[PDB]
Every structure is written in C-alpha cells, then in structure tokens.
Amino acid sequence: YGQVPMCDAGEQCAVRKGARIGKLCDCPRGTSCNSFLLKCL
C-alpha cells in the first residue's frame, strides 16, 4: 500500500492544478515534493 514509481530530482513528482495535487512519483532521498514548483526539492 503506497508503492509508487521512483521520481527524479527535476521530473514532476506531483501536479498542482484544478484543486488537489496529482501524485506522479516519490522524491529521491534528500528531495521533497514541492507542490508550488512541482519538482523534487
């Protein structure tokens, strides 16, 4: 439960649009999911 594709540092890990965020992949250890930039920061 919660398994997701490994996300890259610049690759989009979640899309912020419409209202809620669209999860795509998890950010690599050391990088978080920026809902404003949509990057692994």
mmCIF file with all atom_site columns, N, CA and C in Angstrom:
data_model
loop_
_atom_site.group_PDB
_atom_site.id
_atom_site.type_symbol
_atom_site.label_atom_id
_atom_site.label_alt_id
_atom_site.label_comp_id
_atom_site.label_asym_id
_atom_site.label_entity_id
_atom_site.label_seq_id
_atom_site.pdbx_PDB_ins_code
_atom_site.Cartn_x
_atom_site.Cartn_y
_atom_site.Cartn_z
_atom_site.occupancy
_atom_site.B_iso_or_equiv
_atom_site.pdbx_formal_charge
_atom_site.auth_seq_id
_atom_site.auth_comp_id
_atom_site.auth_asym_id
_atom_site.auth_atom_id
_atom_site.pdbx_PDB_model_num
ATOM 1   N N  . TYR A 1 1  ? 0.858  -1.222 0.000   1.00 0.00 ? 1  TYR A N  1
ATOM 2   C CA . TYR A 1 1  ? 0.000  0.000  0.000   1.00 0.00 ? 1  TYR A CA 1
ATOM 3   C C  . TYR A 1 1  ? 0.883  1.258  0.000   1.00 0.00 ? 1  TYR A C  1
ATOM 4   N N  . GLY A 1 2  ? 0.840  2.038  -1.059  1.00 0.00 ? 2  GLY A N  1
ATOM 5   C CA . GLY A 1 2  ? 1.669  3.290  -1.118  1.00 0.00 ? 2  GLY A CA 1
ATOM 6   C C  . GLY A 1 2  ? 2.850  3.139  -2.093  1.00 0.00 ? 2  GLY A C  1
ATOM 7   N N  . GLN A 1 3  ? 2.977  2.009  -2.751  1.00 0.00 ? 3  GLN A N  1
ATOM 8   C CA . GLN A 1 3  ? 4.110  1.815  -3.713  1.00 0.00 ? 3  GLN A CA 1
ATOM 9   C C  . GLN A 1 3  ? 3.967  2.790  -4.889  1.00 0.00 ? 3  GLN A C  1
ATOM 10  N N  . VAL A 1 4  ? 5.028  3.472  -5.234  1.00 0.00 ? 4  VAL A N  1
ATOM 11  C CA . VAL A 1 4  ? 4.969  4.446  -6.371  1.00 0.00 ? 4  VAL A CA 1
ATOM 12  C C  . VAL A 1 4  ? 6.283  4.416  -7.162  1.00 0.00 ? 4  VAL A C  1
ATOM 13  N N  . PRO A 1 5  ? 6.217  4.882  -8.390  1.00 0.00 ? 5  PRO A N  1
ATOM 14  C CA . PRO A 1 5  ? 7.392  4.953  -9.291  1.00 0.00 ? 5  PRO A CA 1
ATOM 15  C C  . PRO A 1 5  ? 8.418  5.933  -8.703  1.00 0.00 ? 5  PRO A C  1
ATOM 16  N N  . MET A 1 6  ? 9.679  5.581  -8.736  1.00 0.00 ? 6  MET A N  1
ATOM 17  C CA . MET A 1 6  ? 10.733 6.484  -8.175  1.00 0.00 ? 6  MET A CA 1
ATOM 18  C C  . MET A 1 6  ? 10.776 7.782  -8.995  1.00 0.00 ? 6  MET A C  1
ATOM 19  N N  . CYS A 1 7  ? 10.634 8.915  -8.346  1.00 0.00 ? 7  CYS A N  1
ATOM 20  C CA . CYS A 1 7  ? 10.648 10.221 -9.087  1.00 0.00 ? 7  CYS A CA 1
ATOM 21  C C  . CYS A 1 7  ? 12.072 10.788 -9.172  1.00 0.00 ? 7  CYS A C  1
ATOM 22  N N  . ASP A 1 8  ? 12.350 11.540 -10.209 1.00 0.00 ? 8  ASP A N  1
ATOM 23  C CA . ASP A 1 8  ? 13.706 12.155 -10.369 1.00 0.00 ? 8  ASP A CA 1
ATOM 24  C C  . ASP A 1 8  ? 13.737 13.513 -9.629  1.00 0.00 ? 8  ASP A C  1
ATOM 25  N N  . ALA A 1 9  ? 14.881 14.148 -9.580  1.00 0.00 ? 9  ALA A N  1
ATOM 26  C CA . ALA A 1 9  ? 15.004 15.467 -8.876  1.00 0.00 ? 9  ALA A CA 1
ATOM 27  C C  . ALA A 1 9  ? 14.202 16.557 -9.619  1.00 0.00 ? 9  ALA A C  1
ATOM 28  N N  . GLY A 1 10 ? 14.374 16.672 -10.917 1.00 0.00 ? 10 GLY A N  1
ATOM 29  C CA . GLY A 1 10 ? 13.626 17.714 -11.701 1.00 0.00 ? 10 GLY A CA 1
ATOM 30  C C  . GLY A 1 10 ? 12.271 17.164 -12.174 1.00 0.00 ? 10 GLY A C  1
ATOM 31  N N  . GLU A 1 11 ? 12.219 15.895 -12.517 1.00 0.00 ? 11 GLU A N  1
ATOM 32  C CA . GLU A 1 11 ? 10.943 15.272 -13.001 1.00 0.00 ? 11 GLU A CA 1
ATOM 33  C C  . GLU A 1 11 ? 9.762  15.688 -12.105 1.00 0.00 ? 11 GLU A C  1
ATOM 34  N N  . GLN A 1 12 ? 8.582  15.758 -12.666 1.00 0.00 ? 12 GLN A N  1
ATOM 35  C CA . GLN A 1 12 ? 7.387  16.166 -11.870 1.00 0.00 ? 12 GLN A CA 1
ATOM 36  C C  . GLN A 1 12 ? 6.956  15.041 -10.919 1.00 0.00 ? 12 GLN A C  1
ATOM 37  N N  . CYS A 1 13 ? 6.971  15.306 -9.633  1.00 0.00 ? 13 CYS A N  1
ATOM 38  C CA . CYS A 1 13 ? 6.551  14.267 -8.636  1.00 0.00 ? 13 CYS A CA 1
ATOM 39  C C  . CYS A 1 13 ? 5.069  14.450 -8.258  1.00 0.00 ? 13 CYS A C  1
ATOM 40  N N  . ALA A 1 14 ? 4.473  15.551 -8.645  1.00 0.00 ? 14 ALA A N  1
ATOM 41  C CA . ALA A 1 14 ? 3.035  15.810 -8.314  1.00 0.00 ? 14 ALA A CA 1
ATOM 42  C C  . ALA A 1 14 ? 2.547  17.055 -9.074  1.00 0.00 ? 14 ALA A C  1
ATOM 43  N N  . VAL A 1 15 ? 1.380  16.994 -9.671  1.00 0.00 ? 15 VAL A N  1
ATOM 44  C CA . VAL A 1 15 ? 0.872  18.183 -10.438 1.00 0.00 ? 15 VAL A CA 1
ATOM 45  C C  . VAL A 1 15 ? -0.111 19.007 -9.594  1.00 0.00 ? 15 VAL A C  1
ATOM 46  N N  . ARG A 1 16 ? 0.153  20.283 -9.456  1.00 0.00 ? 16 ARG A N  1
ATOM 47  C CA . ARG A 1 16 ? -0.763 21.176 -8.682  1.00 0.00 ? 16 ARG A CA 1
ATOM 48  C C  . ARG A 1 16 ? -1.658 21.926 -9.677  1.00 0.00 ? 16 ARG A C  1
ATOM 49  N N  . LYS A 1 17 ? -2.889 21.501 -9.805  1.00 0.00 ? 17 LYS A N  1
ATOM 50  C CA . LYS A 1 17 ? -3.822 22.157 -10.768 1.00 0.00 ? 17 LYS A CA 1
ATOM 51  C C  . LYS A 1 17 ? -5.271 21.782 -10.431 1.00 0.00 ? 17 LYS A C  1
ATOM 52  N N  . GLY A 1 18 ? -6.213 22.587 -10.858 1.00 0.00 ? 18 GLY A N  1
ATOM 53  C CA . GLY A 1 18 ? -7.652 22.303 -10.563 1.00 0.00 ? 18 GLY A CA 1
ATOM 54  C C  . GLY A 1 18 ? -7.930 22.579 -9.086  1.00 0.00 ? 18 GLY A C  1
ATOM 55  N N  . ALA A 1 19 ? -7.420 21.746 -8.214  1.00 0.00 ? 19 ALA A N  1
ATOM 56  C CA . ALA A 1 19 ? -7.640 21.949 -6.749  1.00 0.00 ? 19 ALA A CA 1
ATOM 57  C C  . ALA A 1 19 ? -6.660 21.080 -5.950  1.00 0.00 ? 19 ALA A C  1
ATOM 58  N N  . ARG A 1 20 ? -6.704 19.780 -6.146  1.00 0.00 ? 20 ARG A N  1
ATOM 59  C CA . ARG A 1 20 ? -5.787 18.866 -5.392  1.00 0.00 ? 20 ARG A CA 1
ATOM 60  C C  . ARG A 1 20 ? -4.502 18.593 -6.198  1.00 0.00 ? 20 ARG A C  1
ATOM 61  N N  . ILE A 1 21 ? -3.547 17.941 -5.580  1.00 0.00 ? 21 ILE A N  1
ATOM 62  C CA . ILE A 1 21 ? -2.260 17.629 -6.275  1.00 0.00 ? 21 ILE A CA 1
ATOM 63  C C  . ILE A 1 21 ? -2.361 16.272 -6.982  1.00 0.00 ? 21 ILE A C  1
ATOM 64  N N  . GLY A 1 22 ? -1.713 16.140 -8.112  1.00 0.00 ? 22 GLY A N  1
ATOM 65  C CA . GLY A 1 22 ? -1.739 14.846 -8.864  1.00 0.00 ? 22 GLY A CA 1
ATOM 66  C C  . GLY A 1 22 ? -0.432 14.104 -8.598  1.00 0.00 ? 22 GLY A C  1
ATOM 67  N N  . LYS A 1 23 ? -0.453 13.130 -7.720  1.00 0.00 ? 23 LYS A N  1
ATOM 68  C CA . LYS A 1 23 ? 0.796  12.371 -7.386  1.00 0.00 ? 23 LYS A CA 1
ATOM 69  C C  . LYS A 1 23 ? 1.340  11.639 -8.624  1.00 0.00 ? 23 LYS A C  1
ATOM 70  N N  . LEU A 1 24 ? 2.634  11.704 -8.842  1.00 0.00 ? 24 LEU A N  1
ATOM 71  C CA . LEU A 1 24 ? 3.247  11.012 -10.022 1.00 0.00 ? 24 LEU A CA 1
ATOM 72  C C  . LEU A 1 24 ? 4.298  10.003 -9.534  1.00 0.00 ? 24 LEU A C  1
ATOM 73  N N  . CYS A 1 25 ? 5.258  10.463 -8.764  1.00 0.00 ? 25 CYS A N  1
ATOM 74  C CA . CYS A 1 25 ? 6.333  9.556  -8.242  1.00 0.00 ? 25 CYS A CA 1
ATOM 75  C C  . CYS A 1 25 ? 6.886  10.126 -6.928  1.00 0.00 ? 25 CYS A C  1
ATOM 76  N N  . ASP A 1 26 ? 7.561  9.323  -6.143  1.00 0.00 ? 26 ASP A N  1
ATOM 77  C CA . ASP A 1 26 ? 8.119  9.834  -4.851  1.00 0.00 ? 26 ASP A CA 1
ATOM 78  C C  . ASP A 1 26 ? 9.489  10.492 -5.089  1.00 0.00 ? 26 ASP A C  1
ATOM 79  N N  . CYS A 1 27 ? 9.801  11.507 -4.326  1.00 0.00 ? 27 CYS A N  1
ATOM 80  C CA . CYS A 1 27 ? 11.110 12.213 -4.497  1.00 0.00 ? 27 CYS A CA 1
ATOM 81  C C  . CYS A 1 27 ? 12.257 11.387 -3.892  1.00 0.00 ? 27 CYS A C  1
ATOM 82  N N  . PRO A 1 28 ? 13.380 11.407 -4.576  1.00 0.00 ? 28 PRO A N  1
ATOM 83  C CA . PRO A 1 28 ? 14.608 10.675 -4.166  1.00 0.00 ? 28 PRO A CA 1
ATOM 84  C C  . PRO A 1 28 ? 15.065 11.127 -2.766  1.00 0.00 ? 28 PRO A C  1
ATOM 85  N N  . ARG A 1 29 ? 15.591 10.205 -1.980  1.00 0.00 ? 29 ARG A N  1
ATOM 86  C CA . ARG A 1 29 ? 16.059 10.537 -0.589  1.00 0.00 ? 29 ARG A CA 1
ATOM 87  C C  . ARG A 1 29 ? 16.832 11.863 -0.588  1.00 0.00 ? 29 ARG A C  1
ATOM 88  N N  . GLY A 1 30 ? 16.412 12.799 0.228   1.00 0.00 ? 30 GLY A N  1
ATOM 89  C CA . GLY A 1 30 ? 17.098 14.129 0.279   1.00 0.00 ? 30 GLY A CA 1
ATOM 90  C C  . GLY A 1 30 ? 16.269 15.175 -0.477  1.00 0.00 ? 30 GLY A C  1
ATOM 91  N N  . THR A 1 31 ? 15.315 14.750 -1.277  1.00 0.00 ? 31 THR A N  1
ATOM 92  C CA . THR A 1 31 ? 14.472 15.724 -2.037  1.00 0.00 ? 31 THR A CA 1
ATOM 93  C C  . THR A 1 31 ? 12.996 15.542 -1.661  1.00 0.00 ? 31 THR A C  1
ATOM 94  N N  . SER A 1 32 ? 12.294 16.628 -1.489  1.00 0.00 ? 32 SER A N  1
ATOM 95  C CA . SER A 1 32 ? 10.848 16.564 -1.115  1.00 0.00 ? 32 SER A CA 1
ATOM 96  C C  . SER A 1 32 ? 9.970  16.911 -2.333  1.00 0.00 ? 32 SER A C  1
ATOM 97  N N  . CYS A 1 33 ? 8.670  16.857 -2.173  1.00 0.00 ? 33 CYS A N  1
ATOM 98  C CA . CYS A 1 33 ? 7.754  17.174 -3.314  1.00 0.00 ? 33 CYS A CA 1
ATOM 99  C C  . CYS A 1 33 ? 7.246  18.616 -3.187  1.00 0.00 ? 33 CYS A C  1
ATOM 100 N N  . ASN A 1 34 ? 7.736  19.506 -4.019  1.00 0.00 ? 34 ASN A N  1
ATOM 101 C CA . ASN A 1 34 ? 7.282  20.930 -3.956  1.00 0.00 ? 34 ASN A CA 1
ATOM 102 C C  . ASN A 1 34 ? 5.968  21.085 -4.739  1.00 0.00 ? 34 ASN A C  1
ATOM 103 N N  . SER A 1 35 ? 4.875  21.327 -4.050  1.00 0.00 ? 35 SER A N  1
ATOM 104 C CA . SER A 1 35 ? 3.550  21.490 -4.741  1.00 0.00 ? 35 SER A CA 1
ATOM 105 C C  . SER A 1 35 ? 3.504  22.815 -5.524  1.00 0.00 ? 35 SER A C  1
ATOM 106 N N  . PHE A 1 36 ? 4.385  23.744 -5.224  1.00 0.00 ? 36 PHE A N  1
ATOM 107 C CA . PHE A 1 36 ? 4.397  25.051 -5.959  1.00 0.00 ? 36 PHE A CA 1
ATOM 108 C C  . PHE A 1 36 ? 5.246  24.910 -7.228  1.00 0.00 ? 36 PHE A C  1
ATOM 109 N N  . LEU A 1 37 ? 6.436  24.377 -7.083  1.00 0.00 ? 37 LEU A N  1
ATOM 110 C CA . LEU A 1 37 ? 7.359  24.206 -8.250  1.00 0.00 ? 37 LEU A CA 1
ATOM 111 C C  . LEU A 1 37 ? 7.086  22.877 -8.976  1.00 0.00 ? 37 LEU A C  1
ATOM 112 N N  . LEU A 1 38 ? 6.490  21.916 -8.301  1.00 0.00 ? 38 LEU A N  1
ATOM 113 C CA . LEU A 1 38 ? 6.209  20.581 -8.936  1.00 0.00 ? 38 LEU A CA 1
ATOM 114 C C  . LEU A 1 38 ? 7.543  19.871 -9.247  1.00 0.00 ? 38 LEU A C  1
ATOM 115 N N  . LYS A 1 39 ? 8.547  20.127 -8.441  1.00 0.00 ? 39 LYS A N  1
ATOM 116 C CA . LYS A 1 39 ? 9.887  19.488 -8.634  1.00 0.00 ? 39 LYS A CA 1
ATOM 117 C C  . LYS A 1 39 ? 10.288 18.777 -7.332  1.00 0.00 ? 39 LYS A C  1
ATOM 118 N N  . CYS A 1 40 ? 11.293 17.935 -7.373  1.00 0.00 ? 40 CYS A N  1
ATOM 119 C CA . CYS A 1 40 ? 11.720 17.227 -6.128  1.00 0.00 ? 40 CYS A CA 1
ATOM 120 C C  . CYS A 1 40 ? 12.699 18.110 -5.346  1.00 0.00 ? 40 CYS A C  1
ATOM 121 N N  . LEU A 1 41 ? 12.182 19.070 -4.619  1.00 0.00 ? 41 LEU A N  1
ATOM 122 C CA . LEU A 1 41 ? 13.051 19.977 -3.810  1.00 0.00 ? 41 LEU A CA 1
ATOM 123 C C  . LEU A 1 41 ? 12.862 19.643 -2.321  1.00 0.00 ? 41 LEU A C  1
#
